RNA sequence: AGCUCUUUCUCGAUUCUGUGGGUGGUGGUGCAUGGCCGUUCUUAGUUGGUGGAGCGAUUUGUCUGGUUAAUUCCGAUAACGAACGAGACUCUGGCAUGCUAACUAGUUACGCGACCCCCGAGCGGUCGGCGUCCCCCAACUUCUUAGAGGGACAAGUGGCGUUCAGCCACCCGAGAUUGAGCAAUAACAGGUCUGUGAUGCCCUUAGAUGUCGGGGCUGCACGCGCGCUACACUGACUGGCUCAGCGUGUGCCUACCCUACGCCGGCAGGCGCGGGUAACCCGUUGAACCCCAUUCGUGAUGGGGAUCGGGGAUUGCAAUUAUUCCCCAUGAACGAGGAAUUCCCAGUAAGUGCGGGUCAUAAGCUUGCGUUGAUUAAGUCCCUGCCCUUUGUACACACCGCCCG
């Protein structure tokens, strides 16, 4: 809607997932911690927004291979 | 703080929250839950604070969403 | 005694004071490449450090102009002799002090020179310093009736936000 | 600009000794704080200074309605003459440093 | 000497200006800054007045 | 500190408004001692942007 | 009842009457003529009203550390109709309240308080509490 | 005004007089110019690399479709991977019996006696009781405060949709959208020379177009725009309940503060004090709507407060052309507004007071702030406005444009 994730976010999600799949999880709370370890992200809101979209992906991937 | 109605809503909320806070440390949990039930059910916010608060007025109207007047020509 | 003055009025006062000072130097030190000032309050002195990069000119023969400046600042800011003090100070690279580069254009054009040569040169020099990006705009009237403006940018710059 | 032959000396003499002068851009305060064996404000001081400058001898900076007056080298010789004073003169520079 | 030459200047628009520019119009007198608005716009950064919202 | 002005210098134009702030922050800290730790503890603790006042006692 | 116990309207109503019976309060000879506030439209319908204000004030002071006429003028002060202009506060008279304050003193209900402002006296504190009880006692209803 | 003149002292080489030359101007031109600013626009617009497509300027990328507040995303597609505006970003404000703290902030709870009232009980000692005051070698951070902390990611679940991007409902709970600030590419004969010791040229410059005395700006058959106040019984009134918040101050660039409290006066106000560089004091901002016990009674009446007369006082050296305020009197139109037309979705519209800017004095203004608080779409492109394709165009100073006798 009004919240459509932008590329800078969506890219990072594709990005991490490509190099992080077996590390990442089903749950928002933990990847968020993981993004601190595996990436340098400048604001907390961005890092959250990233963790969150990539989780939405992991939730989807873990139910059927996702387009790209 | 607030004003005449404002105050009423605050005091009533404080009292019900009070009673429940009290059953939580001294009585037992089932009682307090019973009370949150009755309030929350019928309610009025008694145990939860309503968010709603002033929006700031913006130049060009004397209110927040109110815009002054125009005549065109 | 007092002499006092309000804390809120005091700070605003200090800010304005700094505004004067900055304006005065900007106008005097122009040939000097005056870049900016910093005024540090201490006990028993007021120090004004002039970040300019042509400090040699600021100094003067036998230690002169700085004295001539301190004296001014001291007299105008009712600074009894000796509290207030002035120091010059070379700026690290003249290349990232927008102000140095601007003064430069003023000088180049005033010199007589062209438009594209002056701008392109400043740009090339700034890029050479190794900055992120830079842009120079010239607005106004050259040689003709009508005003025109130009944007001369190189590298990368970000327009918006914090 | 205009003025006395005494006030003029006060201005020249102080200028020669100070090497600098300041005056707020007001023609009314008539008197100015510091020096001022009192008689004037910008005028006699401003005008005398303004005249001194036009012939060279002094460089004037306006900013913020104060007008800051800076004595020049050629000017030092000129006031040297007016004061008639002892060669080596030695005004508002003398100095040490570092 | 010229008793002639002044009438009260104590108060009103006529009793004040811009420490920056003489203008007796649109003068910011709050917090003792005493700058005309046009100037204050140009000097608000060096005074310490910064935009936040 | 809040200042509000029209953006022009000078007017015909949607009436637009600008508000600048200047934010003063205050603190105090209460010490009891003497001689060195006074002038010491004041003077480091020094540099930017920081007014400091030290007061004897009572009145 | 503490005076705090009784509703403000009945308390003031009862005390004001009690003062009337007592017969000794004292009264700027005026009171027939006076408006009580520039804001005011007409004077008071109950020309008898001097007593009511006194009661109101006594109760007003007992509640609080100390109060003075300016506060009362404003309290009594209502909104004044500028006419063309929008309405604004206008603290109500100062002679009436002052006289009220002076008169109350005579009875000792109130006394000059320290650091300005009149405070209730223990004599008054006792007196108000006593009537407060009488009012509470009257009835339920 | 020794300005001019009479009379004749005074200063003492500054000046005068002549030439050449400056200097100011709120003088003119914004259609000669910088900056700043409005507008297109907070619209979704904008561009490069590298390749493909063309002799070439160029084009694709940057799109049929879906979706989005947004060229926001997905997908498809000869493009791929990026940047610019949007966004992210910053600011403000709510959810934190968590965090670290606080005598220039409060609270608990003493120790609390006292004042101390008896308010009820008791015959009283004594018990329970609301406040003020005591202040303490009491305790606290809950309210308050300002710093750091976390929370929202439409997270889970369920329908719908390319089963995608998303959309909708539901839970926890502050619920996805609290509200601003920041603004690109490129434009305009938009506005500004009266903000500028920014500025050109021009104009003027001793008989000034640079200052004082005095007036205009404030002259009234008439039209317009923003507003204010109204048209009454949801009201006008008198007594009485009664709570706040953003902000503010003197000891100042040159004359001066906010003001509680006593007295006098109907008022307006006068007068004597005393604190306060303020989280200390004014100010638990004891506001106003409102609530309420009465009166009025549907009469332009008590709705309304115009105009005028007389009079009191405040500011200022000076108020007459009312600065303003009060007191009385005189007591208008207006009894719901045609053609038209503005603005608006939640603390929002609307009522309602307050504070700041102007300021010596002067608010019907602007500019916020809290208080009281709805009706109503929840969408869409009809009108209007602007940008999206496709299309037409004798247009291109672009329809406010350019065709026949």
From Swiss-Prot, chain B:
One of its GO terms (cellular component) is cytosolic small ribosomal subunit. It is found in: Cytoplasm; Nucleus, Nucleolus. GO terms for molecular function: RNA binding; structural constituent of ribosome. Keywords: Acetylation, Cytoplasm, Nucleus, Phosphoprotein, Ribonucleoprotein, Ribosomal protein. GO terms for biological process: maturation of SSU-rRNA from tricistronic rRNA transcript (SSU-rRNA, 5.8S rRNA, LSU-rRNA); translation. The keyword Ribonucleoprotein applies. Coiled coil: none annotated. Belongs to the universal ribosomal protein uS9 family. Component of the small ribosomal subunit. Part of the small subunit (SSU) processome, composed of more than 70 proteins and the RNA chaperone small nucleolar RNA (snoRNA) U3. Component of the small ribosomal subunit. The ribosome is a large ribonucleoprotein complex responsible for the synthesis of proteins in the cell. Part of the small subunit (SSU) processome, first precursor of the small eukaryotic ribosomal subunit. During the assembly of the SSU processome in the nucleolus, many ribosome biogenesis factors, an RNA chaperone and ribosomal proteins associate with the nascent pre-rRNA and work in concert to generate RNA folding, modifications, rearrangements and cleavage as well as targeted degradation of pre-ribosomal RNA by the RNA exosome. This is Small ribosomal subunit protein uS9. It comes from Oryctolagus cuniculus. The chain holds residues 74 to 146 of 146 of the full protein.
Swiss-Prot record, chain D:
The keyword DNA repair does not apply. The modification Phosphotyrosine is found at residue 12. Transmembrane segments: none annotated. Keywords: Cytoplasm, Isopeptide bond, Methylation, Nucleus, Phosphoprotein, Ribonucleoprotein, Ribosomal protein, Ubl conjugation. Methylated by PRMT5. Methylation is necessary for its interaction with NPS1, its localization in the granular component (GC) region of the nucleolus, for the proper assembly of ribosomes, protein synthesis and optimal cell proliferation. GO terms for molecular function: RNA binding; structural constituent of ribosome. It is found in: Cytoplasm; Nucleus, Nucleolus. GO terms for cellular component: cytosolic ribosome; cytosolic small ribosomal subunit; nucleolus. The keyword Ribosomal protein applies. Component of the 40S ribosomal subunit. The ribosome is a large ribonucleoprotein complex responsible for the synthesis of proteins in the cell. Belongs to the eukaryotic ribosomal protein eS10 family. Component of the small ribosomal subunit. The methylated form interacts with NPM1. This is Small ribosomal subunit protein eS10. It comes from Oryctolagus cuniculus. The lineage of its organism: Eukaryota, Metazoa, Chordata, Craniata, Vertebrata. The gene is RPS10.
From Swiss-Prot, chain E:
Its main location: cytoplasm. GO terms for biological process: cytoplasmic translation. Zn(2+) binds at residues 18, 21, 36, 39. Binds 1 zinc ion per subunit. The keyword Metal-binding applies. The modification N6-acetyllysine is found at residue 45. It is found in: Cytoplasm, Cytosol; Cytoplasm; Rough endoplasmic reticulum. Its cofactor is Zn(2+). The modification Omega-N-methylarginine is found at residue 9. GO terms for cellular component: cytosolic ribosome; cytosolic small ribosomal subunit; rough endoplasmic reticulum. One of its GO terms (molecular function) is structural constituent of ribosome. It comes from the Eukaryota. The modification Phosphoserine is found at residue 6. Keywords: Acetylation, Cytoplasm, Endoplasmic reticulum, Metal-binding, Methylation, Phosphoprotein, Ribonucleoprotein, Ribosomal protein, Zinc. InterPro entries: Ribosomal_uS14 (IPR001209), Ribosomal_uS14_CS (IPR018271), RIbosomal_uS14_euk_arc (IPR039744), Ribosomal_uS14_sf (IPR043140). The keyword Metal-binding applies. Component of the small ribosomal subunit. The ribosome is a large ribonucleoprotein complex responsible for the synthesis of proteins in the cell. Component of the 40S small ribosomal subunit. NCBIfam families: PRK05766.1 (NF004424). Belongs to the universal ribosomal protein uS14 family. This is Small ribosomal subunit protein uS14. It comes from Oryctolagus cuniculus (Rabbit). The lineage of its organism: Eukaryota, Metazoa, Chordata, Craniata, Vertebrata.
Curated annotation (Swiss-Prot), chain G:
The gene is RPS19. One of its GO terms (cellular component) is nucleolus. It comes from Oryctolagus cuniculus (Rabbit). The modification N6-succinyllysine is found at residue 140. Keywords: Acetylation, Cytoplasm, Host-virus interaction, Methylation, Nucleus, Ribonucleoprotein, Ribosomal protein. Coiled coil: none annotated. GO terms for molecular function: RNA binding; structural constituent of ribosome. InterPro entries: Ribosomal_eS19, Ribosomal_eS19_CS, WH-like_DNA-bd_sf, WH_DNA-bd_sf. It is found in: Cytoplasm; Nucleus, Nucleolus. Component of the small ribosomal subunit. The ribosome is a large ribonucleoprotein complex responsible for the synthesis of proteins in the cell. Required for pre-rRNA processing and maturation of 40S ribosomal subunits. Part of the small subunit (SSU) processome, first precursor of the small eukaryotic ribosomal subunit. This is Small ribosomal subunit protein eS19. Component of the small ribosomal subunit. Part of the small subunit (SSU) processome, composed of more than 70 proteins and the RNA chaperone small nucleolar RNA (snoRNA) U3. Interacts with RPS19BP1; the interaction is direct and mediates the integration of RPS19 in state post-A1. Interacts with RPS19BP1. Belongs to the eukaryotic ribosomal protein eS19 family. The modification Omega-N-methylarginine is found at residue 64. Signal peptide: none annotated. It holds the Pfam family Ribosomal_S19e. One of its GO terms (biological process) is translation. The modification N6-acetyllysine is found at residues 20, 108, 112. PANTHER family: 40S RIBOSOMAL PROTEIN S19 (PTHR11710:SF0).
């Amino acid at each position: 809607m009004g919240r459509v994730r932008t590329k800078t976010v969506k890219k990072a999600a594709r990005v991490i997932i490509e190099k992080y799949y077996t590390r990442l999880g089903n749950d928002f709370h933990t990847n968020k911690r993981v993004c601190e370890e595996i990436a340098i992200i400048p604001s907390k809101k961005l890092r959250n927004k990233i963790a969150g979209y990539v989780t939405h992906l992991m939730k989807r991937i873990q139910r059927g291979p996702v387009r790209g | 703080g607030g004003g005449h109605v404002a105050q009423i809503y605050a005091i009533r909320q404080s009292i019900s929250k009070a009673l429940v806070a009290y059953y939580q440390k001294y009585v037992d949990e089932a009682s307090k839950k019973e009370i949150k039930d009755i309030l929350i059910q019928y309610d009025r916010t008694l145990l939860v604070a309503d968010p709603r608060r002033c929006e700031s007025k913006k130049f060009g109207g004397p209110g927040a969403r109110a815009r002054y007047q125009k005549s065109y020509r | 005694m007092a002499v006092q003055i309000s804390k809120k009025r005091k700070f605003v006062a200090d800010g304005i004071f700094k505004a004067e000072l900055n304006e005065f130097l900007t106008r005097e030190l122009a040939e000097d490449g005056y870049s900016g000032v910093e005024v540090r309050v201490t006990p028993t002195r007021t120090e004004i450090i002039i970040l300019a990069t042509r400090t040699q000119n600021v100094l003067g023969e036998k230690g002169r102009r700085i004295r001539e400046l301190t004296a001014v600042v001291q007299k105008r800011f009712g600074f009894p002799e000796g509290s207030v003090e002035l120091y010059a100070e070379k700026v690290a690279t003249r290349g990232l002090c927008a102000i140095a580069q601007a003064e430069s254009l003023r000088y180049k054009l005033l010199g007589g020179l062209a438009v594209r040569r002056a701008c392109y040169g400043v740009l090339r020099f700034i890029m050479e310093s190794g900055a992120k990006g830079c842009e120079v705009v010239v607005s106004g009237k050259l040689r003709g009736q009508r005003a025109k403006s130009m944007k001369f940018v190189d590298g990368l710059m970000i327009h918006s936000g914090d | 600009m205009l003025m006395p032959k005494k006030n003029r000396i006060a201005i020249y003499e102080l200028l020669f000794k100070e090497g600098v002068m300041v005056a707020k851009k007001d023609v009314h305060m008539p008197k100015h704080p510091e020096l001022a064996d009192k008689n004037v404000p910008n005028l006699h001081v401003m005008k005398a200074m303004q005249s001194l400058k036009s012939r060279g001898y002094v460089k004037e900076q306006f900013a913020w309605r104060h007008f800051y007056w800076y004595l020049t080298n050629e000017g030092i010789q000129y006031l040297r003459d007016y004061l008639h004073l002892p060669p080596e003169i030695v005004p508002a520079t003398l100095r040490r440093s570092r | 000497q010229q008793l002639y030459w002044s009438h009260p200047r104590k108060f009103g628009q006529g009793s004040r200006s811009c420490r920056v520019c003489s203008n007796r119009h649109g003068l910011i007198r709050k917090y003792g800054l005493n700058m005309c608005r046009q100037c204050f716009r140009q000097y608000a950064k060096d005074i310490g007045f910064i935009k936040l919202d | 500190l809040r200042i509000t002005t029209r953006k022009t210098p000078c007017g015909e134009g949607s009436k637009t408004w600008d508000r600048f702030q200047m934010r003063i922050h205050k603190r105090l800290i209460d010490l009891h001692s003497p001689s060195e730790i006074v002038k010491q503890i004041t003077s480091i603790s020094i540099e930017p942007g920081v007014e400091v006042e030290v007061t004897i006692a009572d009145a | 009842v503490t005076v705090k116990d009784v509703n403000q309207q009945e308390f003031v109503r009862a005390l004001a009457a009690f003062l009337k019976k007592s017969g000794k309060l004292k009264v700027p000879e005026w009171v027939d003529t006076v408006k009580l506030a520039k804001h005011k439209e007409l004077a008071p319908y109950d020309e008898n009203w001097f007593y009511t204000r006194a009661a109101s004030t006594a109760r007003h002071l007992y509640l609080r550390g100390g109060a003075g006429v300016g506060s009362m003028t404003k309290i009594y002060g209502g909104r004044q109709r500028n006419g063309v202009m929008p309405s604004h506060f206008s603290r109500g008279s100062k002679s009436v309240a002052r006289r009220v304050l002076q008169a109350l003193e005579g009875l000792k209900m109130v006394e000059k308080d320290q650091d300005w402002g009149r405070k209730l006296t223990p004599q008054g504190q006792r007196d108000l509490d006593r009537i407060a009880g009488q009012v509470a006692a009257a009835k339920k209803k």
